[PDB]
Amino acid sequence: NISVDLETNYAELVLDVGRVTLGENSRKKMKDCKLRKKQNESVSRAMCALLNSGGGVIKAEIENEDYSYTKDGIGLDLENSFSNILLFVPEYLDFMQNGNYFLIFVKSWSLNTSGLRITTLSSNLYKRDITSAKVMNATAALEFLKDMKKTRGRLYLRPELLAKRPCVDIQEENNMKALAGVFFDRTELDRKEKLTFTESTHVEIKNFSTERLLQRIKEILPQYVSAFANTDGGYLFIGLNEDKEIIGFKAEMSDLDDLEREIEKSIRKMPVHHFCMEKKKINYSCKFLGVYDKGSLCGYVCALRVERFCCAVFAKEPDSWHVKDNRVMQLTRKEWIQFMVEAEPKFSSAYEEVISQINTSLPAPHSWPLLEWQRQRHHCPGLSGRITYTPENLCRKLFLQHEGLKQLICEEMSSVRKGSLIFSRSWSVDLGLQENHKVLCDALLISQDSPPVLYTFHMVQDEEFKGYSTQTALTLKQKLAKIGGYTKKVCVMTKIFYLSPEGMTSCQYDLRSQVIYPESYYFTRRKYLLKALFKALKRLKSLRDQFSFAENLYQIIGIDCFQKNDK
Amino acid sequence: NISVDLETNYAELVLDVGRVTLGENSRKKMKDCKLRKKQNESVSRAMCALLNSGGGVIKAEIENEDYSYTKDGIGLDLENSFSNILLFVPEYLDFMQNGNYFLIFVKSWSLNTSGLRITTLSSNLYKRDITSAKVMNATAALEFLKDMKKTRGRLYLRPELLAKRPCVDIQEENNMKALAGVFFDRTELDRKEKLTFTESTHVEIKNFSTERLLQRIKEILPQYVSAFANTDGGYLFIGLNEDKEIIGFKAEMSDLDDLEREIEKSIRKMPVHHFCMEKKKINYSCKFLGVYDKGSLCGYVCALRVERFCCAVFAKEPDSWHVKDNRVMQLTRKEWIQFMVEAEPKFSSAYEEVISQINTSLPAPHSWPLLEWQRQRHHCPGLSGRITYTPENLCRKLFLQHEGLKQLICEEMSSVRKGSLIFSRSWSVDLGLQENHKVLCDALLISQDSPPVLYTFHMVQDEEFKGYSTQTALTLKQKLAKIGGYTKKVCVMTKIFYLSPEGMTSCQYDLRSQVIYPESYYFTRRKYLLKALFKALKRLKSLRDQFSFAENLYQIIGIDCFQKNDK
Amino acid sequence: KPILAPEPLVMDNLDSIMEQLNTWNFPIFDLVENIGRKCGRILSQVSYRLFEDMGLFEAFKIPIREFMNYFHALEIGYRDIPYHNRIHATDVLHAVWYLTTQPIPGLSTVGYVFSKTYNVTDDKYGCLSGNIPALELMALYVAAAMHDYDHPGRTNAFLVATSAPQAVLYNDRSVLENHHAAAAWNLFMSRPEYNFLINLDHVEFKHFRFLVIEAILATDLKKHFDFVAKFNGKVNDDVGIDWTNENDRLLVCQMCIKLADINGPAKCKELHLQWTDGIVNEFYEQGDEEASLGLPISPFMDRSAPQLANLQESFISHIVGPLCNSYDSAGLMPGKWVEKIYCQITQHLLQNHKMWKKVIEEEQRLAGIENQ
Amino acid sequence: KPILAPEPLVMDNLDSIMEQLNTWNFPIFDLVENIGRKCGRILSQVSYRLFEDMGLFEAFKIPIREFMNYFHALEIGYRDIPYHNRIHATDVLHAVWYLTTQPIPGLSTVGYVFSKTYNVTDDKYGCLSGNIPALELMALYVAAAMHDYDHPGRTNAFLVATSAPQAVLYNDRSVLENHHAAAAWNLFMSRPEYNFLINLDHVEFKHFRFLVIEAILATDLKKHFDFVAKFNGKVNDDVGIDWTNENDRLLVCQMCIKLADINGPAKCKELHLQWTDGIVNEFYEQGDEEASLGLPISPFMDRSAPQLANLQESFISHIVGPLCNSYDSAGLMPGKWVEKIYCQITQHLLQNHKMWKKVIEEEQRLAGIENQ
Ligand SMILES: O=C1CN2Cc3c(ccc(Cl)c3Cl)N=C2N1
Ligand SMILES: O=C1CN2Cc3c(ccc(Cl)c3Cl)N=C2N1
Ligand SMILES: [Mg+2]
Ligand SMILES: [Mg+2]
Ligand SMILES: [Mg+2]
Ligand SMILES: [Mg+2]
Ligand SMILES: [Zn+2]
Ligand SMILES: [Zn+2]
């Protein structure tokens, strides 16, 4: 399986896909097709699970001995899978081999123009084309399910009337449908006879010259049942050949009942999801016909009729994954369709609209940003006004006591052009997490370069606090990308400090000189991170004092609070 | 080519794709691959041109002698093309063979959740995957172009800094990029030497063991140039083999200049479309390298470096068609990107919002529809109040004179459960068309069943008025589906009447008993047709008096006019 | 000097008639004639009954004497005109009370207060008191009680046409509703014995005032289709109705009083006929004044050429129709199951609309016969 | 009896000073002291100059005597307070005139009227008169002239706090702006000699009144961020500005007068310092009254603990900043090319904001030094 590697110093979800061969020539000349398919499937499961739940990193042990990636590449099956799950590969993926490990860094999935909110390896909703039963891609499945959810069902025009059309010899698909309807009730079939009709959007034909035929039906039937029930219903005949010569399959009695039993079991196992008031079942019906050559029974021809359905019909559960807490799971059907059908709330009051739309930033100065404001404009004596210590009361009080803290913050904030750190009594509880009381305070430095850092301060010379800080940084990264709507690659770095009285030093940990990321994770944008942090705190209902925008002028003018369902 | 058949009695655009073979076995055993590809391409051009411009009908002469379609089907190449251009085939297409002609009825393209506003056979915007240069589908091309139009360019992070990462032996794609960068400036190449790098998202390698090599480059180069310029730039080496053994191609002097000339011509012919202020060109550069075996020149290796571009780069014009007036044309590049980038206006004032949202119609009565109202509730003495003669002043005046008209309208409106005909001084001018003064008036019967009819009345015993009426019905159908937003299949039938004084009869034409449509065109919905007609008249700025909603109560209450930029 | 009150607070001859107050077709004119029509203290009595039912005289400790003082001063405030008088305000108060404290099939409830009786026994019946705190409902009731205060008898468009001082004073933007709320609140704050909100908090009273003024301003017929479209878009594609939202609760009370003020064509035939008689008389008065000032007479407002049935049919089709549709499609209309669901209100509406369609058809038929 | 006019209509000692009226930094206080400050007829004179420039005395045939009558009555109407007085109204009138009749780089023009001078020679310079008919601009100018009429000297939140009669009378919803428009229009319609709109149509006058009242109601600071967000969404993702729309032209004039009423921090340093002195004096008056009524004193409104620079910096950053940004990003701010473009207004804004940031920094530094 796929296990969340809890033994990494990365501030991210790491998934361990087991051993994995790599390289185009090493994959091509791999003499085990089932193993290769299984490895490709494991990597694709990992990548979908990462995309659906914030970011993440996939760690694969290189199976071949001497692997380079600089004269070997990755492969071609994996590249096909990658290019299928995503539209653009360079925008989401980064590959980096770390000695004897191949790491794939995965950006988090973002809402785009397509409208999709989660990625799926396969919807498993088949649709019947003119002739072939194909599987709905992501976009077609979205469109299908949303049209159905709109009408609270699936609109049909059950036989109220045959339209009064002119009399004229004309040929249409309903001709084939009707000829199948007459074929279906025939009580006997003459062996090696011709057919009057071919296969179309309502008619399918299968040879299946198989001695067993049951292991084959058990795996091929549900996709055709879904293809039919998802469009107009239809018939599926077995025992014919390509040249439309009825032959049937050589089946003796005492097996036709077994075959029918397996068919009923298979079609009752297929999932289904209703948007209508009642909740029907898949109305269908099987039948068998003799193929008597001249006076004797040569065999049978199993004819199955499937009626058009009122809501969607799956062949299996939708192929969509996600890591909940650990042990990456598969999205249930109900959750999957809620992600495919519902919209995002997207309230965006007028005050928030202007607070964000300050972030247009055309090729022009566009001064006056509101998310970078402060009353107390005198911190850190030798410096300019280039750092907004935001809470402004938590920071002041934390600077009053813990005298070494202010000096440490000054000696830290020296090499930063422009940034804005945000303190907190504890950031773990501001992200909906378990607080541990030994953590003095926190911070969040968000500068132009140098991706954001989560300082954790404490005065306890017994523990290490690596687990706490890394969990908090991970959760902040995921919350940013999944709720703040930040649409770029991010890493939330870490630093830990000890703060014994009479001494402010001893950085017990520095996550930046411990782990390497691709070249692109090191360039944040610092205004969209602010928008993302604002929206994340708002959506988590923990936005209290960060982003001052002082109200003493608002109270004079008559403008009300920022936003809530409280007035 | 493809010619608009002006010689049909259909109220639609008919396209003539020339002779066309049909049937799966007739297509498969067709001993002319170029001809088969050409026929498939002609049909696909016709179908895209129909989808992009309202509805239409494709008429194909059956090429094989004895063709049935009821034991032959269509084919498989055509089915593949159909299923590619559309998501769902049964929703848009109907096939109907009419003796020695195969007619394909095409619904009009509609805005769906995907966001696409026009269909394209191929965007011709290639993207570079991990290894292969693929062509952007419709959705990826939409996303790409909209992201670019948003930032008014295409955002890069030109070398401001190499991030301060730890020192550790690590392998990445930039390794291959740099090794290519050192390969590119090498002044000479030793024949039959090994390579240190393989092909990735920045590196491509081609064998091309071709005596000419120029007819091949001329056709294969632009798609790789586009794949590179549309993602991160890169290098393209020719003269190598699969096993990474430099061999080169046996080229003598006096041809390398020709090859470079053809390359520059080819890359300057490739279209491009900028969303940035300046308008650069495709910055690139070629080069040739010797492959001297031991003291002699065995050949060359043409190395081409392409730099990442600021806006989109096509291999050819986008493959999108439309019929303008006649002689179905191809959408220019500018129009194509305006259809891919811009949104629809979608004003929808509050009054219109409620006038439409009366059309929810859950499984419940939901009486009180506003688009079916009238003051004068006494027409046609023997009848109920089941027909809304809408203009109410044009209809009254037209009933005052032309005494046989009212009796004719009564004898016509007898067999209709519930409908609403809408008169007009001339419907041709209400759709932006040329009026002919011999047409007395018009009408538009929109009932539950019996698809809408366009009565044309006149008193002139010389002409026929078939051309006028059919043009008007065609234009009304197209305007409904393309501007009113009606999302189902429609045909606008026709009827013509002569109205000499002292006699009201002589229906000179009845389009319903002249032409056959599929079984589904005969079931309209009559409330969405009303919404569509309202929106079409609004968008055409001809909405004057139809849909009464009398204002004498509005003027009392204080509510203003329906909607316009006039108050 | 101030309008204080009548001597015994709760008169008791109108007992056994308020018992039939849990019925949608409250015989209001019967109570009017029963009560001394000489003076008119109907609004105060019905308000006392409703507030005792909700129990707001303990849910907020409102001293009943000052309450009666204020509301008798209010009912004295209402002018003596054909339609917009204190009987109409009692109508609207009873309508909102019924709509918010009578069983609603398929409503899931969660300080709140329920009606006196209400028969709470099942789960398939909710009431709007089980989703809206007591403060919001008290605000809504007092908004309904004082919502047409000191009505001049003319419409907004008339005051805007003649440029009346109430039109200049309020900038021609919902003249009448601003006037009603302004005058009512002015009269409230004038005396000290009117403060029946004496045991409230500063913030509580602020919120109460805000809700009352919003409710009264919701009944401006110009902003009708806007409210309908907003209530459609907030029940159709959204998550439905998140009752924890204050915006949702505010919009629901606004729609409720919108539906209550226009409820002539939702009662039995005789009640609706009486209300229509009143409204036609008032329009006739206004048209009478309008022809004298030289202005072209208004549509429907000519007693010498009446088009009463035209007016009532168009009204029921355009105004009350879509409003009741949007109010019902959100599953808030009070009704009962059928052992699918029976709603008295929309049935009355359909019956009356059909009746006016009969009158229109017959009149046009006879006129076309006679006048050829 | 009515305020009629001063004897000679257009006084002429203030010649050669109105010539420097096509400059953004009009020395308004110099003209104030030049004119007899005993009486005060500045508003009338500047209005006559501006209307003669636009030529509206022939574009609408407005009799100049009744014009001067009305506007002198108006300037008499303005109370004598530190900030919101007739000098402020003359300021705002001149600001809107400059913003709509001075060259705007990159504006494509199309009955219209242009400024007197304007130097129309190129195509790369447009003016707002070349996109807005004469009626809309006359409405906008008269809206600016009477937009703070009879100002009590307090703010909206104060009148709402103490429950002033102007607060009850208007339901606590933009009390002051409704009062300004109401009182001004009342005074206009009072006498017959004030009708300087005598040669208009019924519909013309109706539209004019609508636009004037909308313009005056736009200057309510509570509705500031709403206007900014609406103007952002209508220039950002849309087709831009379809000037044929009346909604677009209305919204543009609303934003223009919004920007004009707050234009202290967009002039030279001394002018802005004078306006700030006025506004701080007015806030000090209001705080003085507020401490006497027992209410907790308002922020920034304590002359015994002034935070003037705090107020001005926060104001420039929060109010005038985003407004000028949204107004400029739509390419309407008047400026000049650079043989890319130089805009005087935003430069003045940046300079003043930096100055107040100096004062804040120095004060906090000194206080942290002294108080440890
Ligand atoms: O039964 C009834 C009650 N009402 C009220 C009403 C109206 C038409 C206009 C207005 Cl403004 C009003 Cl309040 N029609 C009816 N009919
Ligand atoms: O130069 C100036 C001019 N003004 C006006 C002003 C203000 C703060 C509040 C209000 Cl309400 C107003 Cl009108 N600050 C400044 N500063
Ligand atoms: Mg009212
Ligand atoms: Mg009322
Ligand atoms: Mg003001
Ligand atoms: Mg002002
Ligand atoms: Zn279903
Ligand atoms: Zn470009």
Numbering used by the authors:
A (entry chain B), B (entry chain D): 2 to 568
C (entry chain C), D (entry chain A): 669 to 778, 800 to 1028, 1070 to 1102
Kindly provide excerpts from the paper associated with this entry.
Our previous screening efforts using an FDA-approved compound library showed that anagrelide dose-dependently induced HeLa cells death. To investigate the molecular basis of the PDE3A-SLFN12 complex triggered by those compounds, we subjected the purified protein complexes to single-particle cryo-EM analysis and determined the structures of the SLFN12-PDE3A complexes with anagrelide (3.4 Å resolution), DNMDP (3.2 Å) or nauclefine (3.2 Å). The detailed cryo-EM structure clearly indicated that anagrelide acts as a molecular glue to form a stable ternary complex with PDE3A and SLFN12. Taking anagrelide as an example, the hydrogen-bonding interaction networks are formed between PDE3A enzymatic pocket and the hydrophilic imidazolidinone moiety of anagrelide. The H-bond network involves the carbonyl group of anagrelide and the nitrogen in the side chain of H961, and the nitrogen atoms of anagrelide with the side chain of Q1001. Additionally, anagrelide is stacked with the phenyl ring in the side chain of PDE3A’s F1004. SLFN12’s helix is positioned at the mouth of the PDE3A enzymatic pocket, and the side chains of its L554, I557, and I558 residues comprise a highly hydrophobic moiety for interactions with the hydrophobic phenyl ring of anagrelide, together with the L910, I951, I968, F972, L1000, and F1004 residues of PDE3A. Anagrelide’s phenyl moiety engaged in pi−pi stacking with PDE3A’s F1004, which was essential for its binding to PDE3. We also observed that the 7-Cl group of anagrelide engages in hydrophobic interactions with PDE3A and SLFN12, specifically with PDE3A’s T844, F972, L910, and SLFN12’s I557, I558. The hydrophobic interaction mediated by anagrelide plays a central role at the PDE3A-SLFN12 heterodimer interaction interface, although there are also three hydrogen bonds dispersed at distant sites. We thus chose anagrelide over the other two small molecules to further optimization based on the anagrelide-induced PDE3A-SLFN12 structure.
PDE3A is a phosphodiesterase that catalyzes the hydrolysis of cyclic adenosine monophosphate (cAMP) or cyclic guanosine monophosphate (cGMP). A structurally diverse group of chemicals, including 17-β-estradiol (E2), anagrelide, nauclefine, and DNMDP, induces apoptosis by forming complexes with phosphodiesterase 3A (PDE3A) and Schlafen 12 protein (SLFN12). They do so by binding to the PDE3A enzymatic pocket that allows the compound-bound PDE3A to recruit and stabilize SLFN12, which in turn blocks protein translation, leading to apoptosis. The PDE3A-SLFN12 complexes exhibit a butterfly-like shape, forming a heterotetramer with these small molecules, which are packed in a shallow pocket in the catalytic domain of PDE3A.
